[PDB]
Specification:
By secondary structure, the chain is mostly helical. The chain is about 45% helix and about 0% strand. The protein has 8 helices and no strands. Helix 3 packs antiparallel against helix 4 and helix 5 crosses helix 7 (about 170-175). According to PubMed:12973301, colocalizes with nascent proteasome. According to PubMed:15778719, associates with proteasome core particles and also forms a complex with regulatory particle-core particle (RP-CP). This is Proteasome activator BLM10. It is found in: Nucleus; Cytoplasm. Belongs to the BLM10 family.
């Protein structure tokens, strides 16, 4: 529990994550490359769909969606609980690497590495906009020794200029991704001289 998706919540969370894909593989792969679609994920088709050359059933697009939904509520709880330097391990309580299972590990650094492993598959540019928004403001966190290098590299991967010839910067510009330049400018201004050296 504690954020597990094993109820009717999973439907509404998939709908919120635009992960309520069409159940036909054929129609889904078509509406994955069509900008008029809710589930638009890429502008350019991979000419070699390397998963379709394997001699066994790879997992369903619905399984890849259901996995990403768990990674995202766990990443939300991890960041929204403010503990970005993940020192404080939690447990079962009195208050009243790549398998998703009943153990819940409230560390931002775990779930960003889960999401790095989900980047090998499609998700709609609407969910890519939410994720580019999250990793931008997360990478500017202060107070504690966060693993900043991998939060910058996650944003760099989310906004990529060349990913199977898709430019996600211009797809996110056409989606209306907007970022506050003042937070970035203020943090870069902390390297200007300050009038007390203490």
């Amino acid at each position: 529990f504690n954020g597990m998706d094993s109820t009717s919540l999973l439907n509404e969370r998939l709908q919120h994550y635009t992960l309520d894909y069409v159940s036909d593989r054929a129609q889904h792969m078509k509406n994955i490359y069509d900008p008029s679609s809710r589930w638009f994920s890429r502008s350019v088709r991979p000419e070699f769909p390397i998963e379709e050359f394997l001699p066994y059933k790879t997992e369903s697009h619905e399984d890849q969606a259901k996995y990403l939904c768990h990674v995202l509520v766990n990443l939300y709880i991890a960041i929204s609980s403010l503990d970005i330097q993940g020192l404080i391990s939690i447990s079962s309580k009195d208050l009243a690497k790549i398998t998703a299972k009943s153990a819940t590990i409230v560390n931002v650094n775990h779930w960003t590495n889960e999401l790095k492993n989900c980047l090998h598959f499609d998700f709609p540019v609407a969910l890519r906009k939410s994720l580019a928004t999250v990793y931008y403001y997360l990478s500017l966190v202060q107070g504690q020794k966060v693993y900043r290098q991998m939060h910058v590299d996650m944003f760099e991967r989310l906004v990529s200029l060349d990913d199977d010839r898709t430019n996600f910067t211009e797809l996110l510009q056409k989606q209306g991704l907007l970022l506050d330049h003042q937070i970035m400018l203020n943090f870069l201004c902390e390297f200007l001289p300050y009038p007390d050296p203490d």
